[PDB]
From a paper:
Our designs focused on the g-a-d-e sites of the classical coiled-coil heptad sequence repeat gabcdef, as these sites contribute most to the helix–helix interfaces. Specifically, we investigated 20 sequence combinations in which g = Ala, Gly, Leu, Met or Ser, and a and d = Ile or Leu. We solved high-resolution X-ray crystal structures of three peptides using ab initio phasing. One structure, with g-a-d-e = Ala-Leu-Ile-Ala, revealed an antiparallel hexamer consistent with its solution-phase oligomer state. However, this was a collapsed bundle, conflicting with the solution-phase binding data that suggest that this peptide can access an open α-helical barrel. Also, we have reported a parallel α-helical barrel that accesses both an open barrel and a collapsed bundle in the crystal state but still binds DPH with low micromolar affinities. Thus, it is possible that Ala-Leu-Ile-Ala and Gly-Leu-Ile-Ala can also access an open conformation in solution.
Here we describe efficient routes starting from validated parallel and antiparallel peptide assemblies to design two families of α-helical barrel proteins with central channels that bind small molecules. Computational designs are seeded by the sequences and structures of defined de novo oligomeric barrel-forming peptides, and adjacent helices are connected by loop building. For targets with antiparallel helices, short loops are sufficient. However, targets with parallel helices require longer connectors; namely, an outer layer of helix–turn–helix–turn–helix motifs that are packed onto the barrels.
Residue numbers in the entry:
A (entry chain D), B (entry chain F), C (entry chain C), D (entry chain B), E (entry chain E), F (entry chain A): 1 to 30
The structure:
């Protein structure tokens, strides 16, 4: 579906952003 | 410090994007 | 419903981001 | 200016999330 | 129309994340 | 260092989010 493809892409963006956020936390703490 | 705050904000933003994706899926399912 | 529940969560994230924004302004100012 | 720039960006994201929440309620209400 | 408002809000979030990326680069290269 | 990598990744996330928003706008338009 059209909106399902948009949502899938958004979910991948969000998972990538969560990883970046964790990496930045660890750099910050260190 | 500031970078740890920024990391938390990126995590909040990722959470919002994931929820927006689920909202789009529910809209499609309607 | 499902979309209204997401809307509430997004409003809470928005408040969290505004709190972090003020924390960053405080760090910059001080 | 870096931290203040990020704070301003987070505030704009917060506004955008409130806009999305409002749109979701409008969709939900039909 | 509400879905278009959601898309416009996502565009604003993307611009704001670009500004956050730019600010973090400035901190990194400082 | 790491923060430069994080900023570049965030810029890539923002570019992708812009494309997602544009696709959603076109869906919303018909």
């Amino acid at each position: 579906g059209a909106l399902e493809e948009i949502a899938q892409a958004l979910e991948e963006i969000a998972k990538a952003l969560k990883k970046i956020a964790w990496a930045l936390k660890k750099i910050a703490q260190g």
